[PDB]
Structure formats: structure tokens, C-alpha cells
Amino acid sequence: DTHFPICIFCCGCCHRSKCGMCCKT
16 A cells, blocks of 8 residues: 555465565555
């Protein structure tokens, strides 16, 4: 949601089986 948050990298292990930056929360 944040325009420029932390965007810490986080691979979708279980929910979404896809890697993606955890910008929101």
C-alpha cells in the first residue's frame, strides 16, 4: 500500500507460489 515502504524481498512460499517484494504488509 505504501508508495515507498521497505519492500523487503519475500518469496511466496505457501500463499502465492511466487517470489515478490513485501512492499505492503
